[PDB]
Amino acid sequence: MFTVTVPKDLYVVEYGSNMTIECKFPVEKQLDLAALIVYWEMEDKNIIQFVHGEEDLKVQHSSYRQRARLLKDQLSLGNAALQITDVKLQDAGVYRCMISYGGADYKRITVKVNAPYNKINQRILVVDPVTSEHELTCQAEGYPKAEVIWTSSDHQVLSGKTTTTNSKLFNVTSTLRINTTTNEIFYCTFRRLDPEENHTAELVIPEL
Amino acid sequence: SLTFYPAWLTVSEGANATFTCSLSNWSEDLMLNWNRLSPSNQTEKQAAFSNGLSQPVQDARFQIIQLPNRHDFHMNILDTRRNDSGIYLCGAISLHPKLKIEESPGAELVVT
């Protein structure tokens, strides 16, 4: 009996990349476009309505204005492939694909989105020139929540203050106050999970 | 809206289990799917009612019976096996005038 299959129940995709999620269905001889319906949706939002052999750009929700399309070439191979461009955190969730082709069936696809902490902004400020206290800051955004670890040239763990807010990208910022010298090297490391990821920046104390 | 009950049903292996799928606005053009959930929470069609009749995907122990009042259905797992244990739900697919998937809440079968 007609059945839709999925290769992957779950997609983990990098933030701002392009997403191709797939629903597979039986196609014996050449594709009869008249009988084929393909419906992609998310949280009761109409994404793709492929009817009478042509996409109806009317019934689609505005959220997917430019960013959503079905790969026609793939249909002749029994692959309902939905490509979403420039994936954002709001695109995480459960997608359903529904195919009618001599029988009907639907499947759920779960989308999980990561955002790496790689744009790490830093700053070094002199707090008191006599004792040479400096304030060192490391800020970066991503998802999910990262903690920040401070290490010195020794790789001996230090004690900083970390504030986590929203942008919902997390904006993570961490400050270390410490007495130091010219040329001392410090590292700030953003440790995130889902999956694990350790992203480091380096701060070098400049001349006074 | 669809309801699917009892929310939790146990029976001995070898015995039939009957759930009810109840629809608030049934018409004869709808297709009604009897679904099982996988561990990752994927739906897997067991049987489908359309055009007057129920038909199984690969095991005819999964039987949908339309009740006389027409908007209610018996989803029967006949001659149960321990392996039939899990979560099930019914779902309606509408093609006209608007595409719609409507799913009930899951109910649990425990076969002992």
Q: Does B93 touch chain A (CB under 8 A)?
A: yes
Can you tell me the distance from the alpha carbon of B88 to that of B106, in angstroms, rounded to the nearest whole number? 5
Encoded tokens for A198: 């350790």
Can you tell me the distance from the alpha carbon of B58 to that of B74, in angstroms, rounded to the nearest whole number? 19
Chain A CB contacts of B33 below 8 Å: 105-106
Resolution of the determined structure in angstroms stands at 2.3
Measured in angstroms, the CA of B72 and the nearest CA of chain A are apart by 21
Q: Which of B53, B80, B84, B69 is nearest to B21 (CA)?
A: B69
Q: Does B42 touch chain A (CB under 8 A)?
A: yes
Measured in angstroms, the CA of A186 and the nearest CA of chain B are apart by 43
Encoded tokens for A4: 């839709």
User: Which residue, chain included where needed, has tokens 């960013």?
Assistant: A67
User: Which residue, chain included where needed, has tokens 């009869």?
Assistant: A32
Q: Where are the domains of chain B?
A: 1-112
Residue A25 backbone zone (phi > 0: left; psi -120 to 50: alpha; other: beta):
beta
What one-character DSSP code corresponds to residue A115?
A: B
Q: Counting beta carbons within 10 angstroms of the beta carbon of residue A110, is it exposed (0 to 12), middle (13 to 18) or buried (19 or more)?
A: middle
Encoded tokens for A65: 């204005």
- Contact (CB<8Å) B42/A39: no
Pick A107's closest partner by Cβ from B43, B57, B99.
Answer: B43
B1-112 domain in CATH 2.60.40.10?
A: yes
Q: Counting beta carbons within 10 angstroms of the beta carbon of residue A29, is it exposed (0 to 12), middle (13 to 18) or buried (19 or more)?
A: exposed
- Contact (CB<8Å) B33/A105: yes
Can you tell me the distance from the alpha carbon of B80 to that of A3, in angstroms, rounded to the nearest whole number? 24
Q: Which fold has domain A116-208?
A: Immunoglobulin-like (2.60.40)
- Contact (CB<8Å) B101/A9: no
φ/ψ of A7, rounded to 5, equals -65, -40
Encoded tokens for A54: 């042509």
Measured in angstroms, the CA of A205 and the nearest CA of chain B are apart by 50
Q: State the DSSP H helix or E strand holding residue A185, giving kind and residue range, or none if neither.
A: strand A185-192
Amino acid identity, residue A74?
A: Q
Q: Which of A44-70 are b and which e, b meaning 16 or more Cβ less than 10 Å from the residue's Cβ?
A: eebbbbbeeeebeeeebeeebeebbeb
Q: Which of A117, A75, A111, A106 is nearest to A93 (CA)?
A: A111
Pick B99's closest partner by Cβ from A6, A10, A98.
Answer: A98
Contact between A55 and A75 (Cβ < 8 Å): no
Q: Where in the sequence of chain A do the CATH 2.60.40.10 domains occur?
A: 1-115, 116-208
Superfamily name with CATH number, domain A1-115:
Immunoglobulins (2.60.40.10)
Can you tell me the distance from the alpha carbon of B76 to that of A88, in angstroms, rounded to the nearest whole number? 43
What residues have CB less than 8 Å from B27, skipping those under 6 apart?
none
